[PDB]
Design a protein around this ligand. Structure first.
Ligand SMILES: [Zn+2]
Length: 255
């Protein structure tokens, strides 16, 4: 699977038939159709004690891993039940500033999209959480091109060391609080992972308010390679999935 002409999104269903399931992600957020639900609680992010371990190039994106052995970095509140622990964050970007995000707002595409993945501690581990409907909670954050994001520089600076597929680097004392928008107003809906095995275990929480990153920041993203070291160079760009059918599901807004 990949994002090329022969292994792209349109071909995933052959290996992962759930690709055409009933609660696939990402989706287009039609803001006029979204239902304002007064019964939603504010999001509750506790990241002061988060512990990053390292960053890696898995050949389809770059992930920053976190130590989820204890409730150090957790999400609760909102449309959620119980505690969800931060395990990793993944990014998705395009070849141009005009595309990159997975989720779209009234068909508008942002330059990139950041996903903060959390699992339900009721299930004991991440492997068990993905076999459940309320197993995961992903906080989606859009990135628009404008001013630099001070908080993101530490990640940009380390990308050189994880250029190719399989490379990994020690990445400690990285505080994710640096990537949060000012407002925590959100959209919520039941969906799935955006990449295979595309399991329908996710409660999506998409922030209304996007973060701005400089052009030279996102430019460094586009220097990553899909390929392994010693192979033909294939740039990691356009690692995003096209919006999937809503199909009955409803998008609720906390605002
Ligand atoms: Zn992602």
């Amino acid at each position: 699977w990949g994002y090329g002409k022969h292994n792209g999104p349109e071909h995933w269903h052959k290996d992962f038939p759930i690709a055409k399931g009933e609660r696939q992600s990402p989706v287009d957020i039609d803001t006029h159709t979204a239902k304002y639900d007064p019964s939603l609680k504010p999001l509750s992010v506790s990241y002061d004690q988060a512990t990053s371990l390292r960053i890696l190039n898995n050949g389809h994106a770059f992930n920053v891993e976190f130590d989820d052995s204890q409730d150090k970095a957790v999400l609760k509140g909102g449309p959620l039940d119980g505690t969800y622990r931060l395990i990793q964050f993944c990014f998705h970007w395009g070849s141009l500033d005009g595309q990159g995000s997975e989720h779209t707002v009234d068909k508008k595409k942002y330059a990139a999209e950041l996903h903060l993945v959390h699992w339900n501690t009721k299930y004991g581990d991440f492997g068990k959480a993905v076999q459940q409907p309320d197993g995961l909670a992903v906080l989606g954050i859009f990135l628009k091109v404008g001013s630099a994001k001070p908080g993101l520089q530490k990640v940009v600076d380390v990308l050189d060391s994880i250029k190719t597929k399989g490379k990994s680097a020690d990445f400690t004392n990285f505080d994710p609080r640096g990537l949060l928008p000012e407002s925590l107003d959100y959209w919520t809906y039941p969906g799935s992972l955006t990449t295979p095995p595309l399991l329908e275990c996710v409660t999506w929480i998409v922030l209304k308010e996007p973060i701005s990153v400089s052009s030279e920041q996102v430019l460094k993203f586009r220097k990553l390679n899909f390929n392994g070291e010693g192979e033909p160079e294939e740039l990691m760009v356009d690692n995003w999935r096209p919006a999937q059918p809503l199909k009955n599901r409803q998008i609720k807004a906390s605002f």
